C-alpha cells in the first residue's frame, strides 16, 4: 500500500522547488516497484526497474530529488561519481564497489534503524534490572495471590523516586548497552539489509556524461567507455560479492545524471542507452526560484538559521525584500563569476549571517530583523568586487 | 598600437589607442587596450591579443591577490609563470601596469622592467610617444594625463599602426 505518483510528487514538493517533470519521473519509478510486487511470479522476473537519466545544470535539484525519493521510500541510497572509475587505468577502483558501498550503507541503516527501534524498551527493562537491585521479591508468589500479590507498592514509588531523581543512572546506561545487545539478532539483520539493497536499492550515478566519447583521443575514450562497460552488468542484472553476502543488482533502481553540454545521451554506449529508458530535463533556476528555495522548503535554510539562532535565545526574522535581496545576490555572483546553482545561496546566506551568528549568544533575548537594508549593507560590496567574489562567495 | 604610461605628482596614467590592424587594413578601430584591475587599485595596458590580455591580466590580478598587493613582486611572479607554462608561454603581448607605488613593464620573456621616470611607451608607437612624452615632461608643467594624452596623439599622427581613439585610466594618491 504505497503512495501514488501524485502523492510522491507532493511529498517531494515539500523539499524541492520546481523541477516537476523530474519529480513525476522519479515518481513513476517508485510507483512501478509497487506495481511489480502486484504481479504473478512470471512477470515479476521480467519487469525490471525503469532507470532514469536526469539531464541538467549543476545544483538545480538532481541529487536532492534522488535523495528525497530514497528517503520517502525508506530505501537504502548511495551517490557515486562516474569518473571515479576512469582512474582504474592507473589503479582507480572497480564498479562493484558501488553495490558493495551501497550494501554497507544499507547495513548501517538496518542497524541504526533497528537499534533505535529498541533503545526505549531496553531502558524500561533496564530499570526493571535496577528496580530489582532495590527490592527483589522475585520467584513465584511471596505473599497473597490477589491483594498482597502485587509487589509494585513500594517498588512503584521506588522506581519513580529514581527515574525523576554504581549510581542508578550510571548503572542503567551500562544495562542499556547490555540489554539492547542482548536483544539484537545479527543473523537476519545481515540478510535484512541485503533484501533492502535488492528490492529498494537506489544508486545515483553522477557525471554520466563525463564517461562519454568525444573525438578527443583513443586512450581517454577507452578509459571512459570502459567505465560504461563495467557498469553494464550492474544495470543489466548481475550478482555482486558483498562483505555481508551476495546481492543481485537485478532490481536496484538507477538514476544517472549528466549536464550533456559537451556530450549527448546518444554518445552513451548502446547497451546503456537501452537501460536508461527514461529521459528527463531539469531547468536552470531563476531568481524567483531562488527566493522560494530560501524559504518554502519545510526545512529551508532560512528556517534552519532561524532555529539555530533561537538556540541562542535570539529571534531572527527575514523580510520579503530581505529574501529577495539575498536571492539576487546569489544570482548576481553566479552570473558574474561561475554559476553553481542553488549552492550559491548557502555561501551567500552564510556570509550574510556571520556577524550575528558570532554575536548571537550576546543578543540573547533580542529581536533581530534581517531586512533588505541589512542584506545590502553586508553583501553588495562583495557581490560587486568580482575577484573578491571568487574567494568569499 | 601605442601604450603610454606617465607619472606626475599624485597621479599616474596609462593611455592607449584603439587601432587593431591586420595586413594593411584596419580590423577594428575602437579596441580598448587599457583597463582597471584589483578593485580598480591597479591600472594596466596591453599591446596584443585582445584575449591573451584577458588571460594575463587575470592571473596578474591573481598574484596581487595572495601577495598582499606588492605590485612589483606580483609582476615578478606573473612573468615567472608566463615564461614557464606552455599555456601562458603560448600567448604574446606587452604588459604595462602601474599603481600608487610604481609602474612597470612585463613581457613574455619573463622580463619585469621599469623605465627611468616610470614613463612607459610600448607598442609600434612607443618610441614616438616617448620622444613627445619626454619633451613635455622635460619642458612643461602639464599633468600626468595631459602628457600621456598629447604624447599618444602625437604618436597617432606619426605611426601608421596607431589611431587617435583613446582609452585612459588614472590613479590619484
Cβ neighbours of residue B120 under 8 Å, at least 6 residues apart? B3, B4, B5, B6, B14, B45, B96, B98, B103, B104, B105
Q: How far apart are CA A45 and CA A40, in angstroms?
A: 9
B62: closest chain A residue by CA: A387
- Cell representation of residue B146: 595631459
Q: How far apart are CA A220 and CA A223, in angstroms?
A: 5
Q: How far apart are CA A66 and CA A61, in angstroms?
A: 9
Residue A388 touches chain B, beta carbons under 8 Å: yes
Determine which of A387, A388, A389 to mutate to test the interface with B (most B C-beta atoms within 10 Å): A387
Closest C-alpha among B11, B12, B13, B31 to residue B21: B31
Q: Distance of alpha carbon B167 from its chain centroid, rounded?
A: 11
Q: CB–CB of B94/B122 below 8 Å?
A: yes
Phi/psi of residue B105, each to 5°?
-115, 130
Q: Which domains does chain A have, with CATH numbers?
A: 1-108+194-282 (3.40.50.300), 109-193 (1.10.8.10), 285-392 (1.10.8.60)
Determine whether the annotation assigns residue B18 to a binding site.
no
The DSSP secondary-structure symbol of A2 reads P
H or E, element range at A248: strand A245-248
Q: Which domains does chain B have, with CATH numbers?
A: 1-173 (3.60.20.10)
Q: CB–CB of B106/B75 below 8 Å?
A: yes
CA distances to A298, B18, B94, B114, B168 from B131, rounded to whole Å, are: 71, 20, 19, 17, 19
Q: CB–CB of B26/B34 below 8 Å?
A: no
Q: How far apart are CA B54 and CA B117, in angstroms?
A: 27
The single residue listed with the C-alpha cell 529498494 is A200
- Cell representation of residue A71: 528517503
* Solving technique: X-ray
Q: Are strands A315-318 and A278-281 parallel, antiparallel or unpaired?
A: unpaired
| 3-state SS, residue A300 | coil
Contacts of B60 in chain A (CB under 8 A): none
Q: CB–CB of A255/A51 below 8 Å?
A: yes
Is B1 a residue of the active site? yes
Residue B61 touches chain A, beta carbons under 8 Å: yes
Q: How far apart are CA A302 and CA A345, in angstroms?
A: 10
Q: How far apart are CA A33 and CA A2, in angstroms?
A: 9
Cβ neighbours of residue A176 under 8 Å, at least 6 residues apart? A119, A122, A123, A126
Amino acid at each position: 500500500s504505497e503512495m501514488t505518483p501524485r502523492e510522491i510528487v507532493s511529498e517531494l514538493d515539500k523539499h524541492i522547488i520546481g523541477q516537476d517533470n523530474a519529480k513525476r519521473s522519479v515518481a513513476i519509478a517508485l510507483r512501478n516497484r509497487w506495481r511489480r510486487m502486484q504481479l504473478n511470479e512470471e512477470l515479476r522476473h521480467e519487469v525490471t526497474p525503469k532507470n532514469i537519466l536526469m539531464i541538467g545544470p549543476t545544483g538545480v535539484g538532481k541529487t536532492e530529488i534522488a535523495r528525497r525519493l530514497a528517503k520517502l521510500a525508506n530505501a537504502p541510497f548511495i551517490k557515486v561519481e562516474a569518473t571515479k572509475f576512469t582512474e582504474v587505468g592507473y589503479v582507480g577502483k572497480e564498479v562493484d564497489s558501488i553495490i558493495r558501498d551501497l550494501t554497507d550503507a544499507a547495513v548501517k541503516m538496518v542497524r541504526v534503524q533497528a537499534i533505535e527501534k529498541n533503545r526505549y524498551r531496553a531502558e524500561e527493562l533496564a530499570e526493571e534490572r535496577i528496580l530489582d537491585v532495590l527490592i527483589p521479591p522475585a520467584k513465584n508468589n511471596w505473599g497473597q495471590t490477589e491483594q498482597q500479590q502485587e509487589p509494585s507498592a513500594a517498588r512503584q514509588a521506588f522506581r519513580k523516586k529514581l527515574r525523576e531523581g554504581l549510581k542508578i543512572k550510571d548503572a542503567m546506561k551500562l544495562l542499556i548497552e547490555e540489554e539492547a545487545a542482548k536483544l539484537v539478532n545479527p543473523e537476519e539483520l545481515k540478510q535484512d539489509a541485503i533484501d533492502a539493497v535488492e528490492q529498494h536499492g537506489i544508486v545515483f550515478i553522477d557525471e554520466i556524461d563525463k564517461i562519454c566519447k568525444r573525438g578527443e583521443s583513443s586512450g581517454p575514450d577507452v578509459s571512459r567507455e570502459g567505465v560504461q562497460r563495467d557498469l553494464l552488468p550492474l544495470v543489466e542484472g548481475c550478482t555482486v560479492s558483498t562483505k555481508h553476502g551476495m546481492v543481485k543488482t537485478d532490481h536496484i533502481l538507477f538514476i544517472a545524471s549528466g549536464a550533456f553540454q559537451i556530450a549527448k545521451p546518444s554518445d552513451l554506449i548502446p547497451e546503456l542507452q537501452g537501460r536508461l529508458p527514461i529521459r528527463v530535463e531539469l531547468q536552470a533556476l531563476t531568481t524567483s526560484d531562488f527566493e522560494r528555495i530560501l524559504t518554502e522548503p519545510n526545512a529551508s535554510i532560512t528556517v534552519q538559521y532561524k532555529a539555530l539562532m533561537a538556540t541562542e535565545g535570539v529571534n531572527i526574522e527575514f523580510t520579503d525584500s530581505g529574501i529577495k535581496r539575498i536571492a539576487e545576490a546569489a544570482w548576481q555572483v553566479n552570473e558574474s563569476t561561475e554559476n553553481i546553482g542553488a549552492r550559491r545561496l548557502h555561501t551567500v546566506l552564510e556570509r550574510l549571517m556571520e556577524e550575528i551568528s558570532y554575536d548571537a549568544s550576546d543578543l540573547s533575548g533580542q529581536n533581530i530583523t534581517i531586512d533588505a537594508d541589512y542584506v545590502s549593507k553586508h553583501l553588495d560590496a562583495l557581490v560587486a568586487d568580482e575577484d573578491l567574489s571568487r574567494f568569499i562567495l | 598600437t601605442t601604450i603610454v604610461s606617465v607619472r606626475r605628482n599624485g597621479h599616474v596614467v596609462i593611455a592607449g589607442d584603439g587601432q587593431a590592424t591586420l595586413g594593411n587594413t584596419v580590423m577594428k578601430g575602437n579596441v580598448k587596450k587599457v583597463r582597471r584591475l584589483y578593485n580598480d587599485k591597479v591600472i594596466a595596458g596591453f599591446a596584443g591579443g585582445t584575449a591573451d590580455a584577458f588571460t594575463l591580466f587575470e592571473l596578474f590580478e591573481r598574484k596581487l591577490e595572495m601577495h598582499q598587493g606588492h605590485l612589483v613582486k606580483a609582476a615578478v611572479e606573473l612573468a615567472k609563470d608566463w615564461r614557464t607554462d606552455r599555456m601562458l608561454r603560448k600567448l604574446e603581448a606587452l604588459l604595462a601596469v602601474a599603481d600608487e607605488t610604481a609602474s612597470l613593464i612585463i613581457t613574455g620573456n619573463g622580463d619585469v622592467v621599469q623605465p627611468e621616470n616610470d614613463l612607459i611607451a610600448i607598442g609600434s608607437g612607443g618610441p614616438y610617444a616617448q620622444a613627445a612624452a619626454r619633451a613635455l615632461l622635460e619642458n612643461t608643467e602639464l599633468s600626468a594625463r595631459e602628457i600621456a594624452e598629447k604624447a599618444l596623439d602625437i604618436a597617432g599622427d606619426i605611426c601608421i599602426y596607431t589611431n587617435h581613439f583613446h582609452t585612459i585610466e588614472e590613479l590619484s594618491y
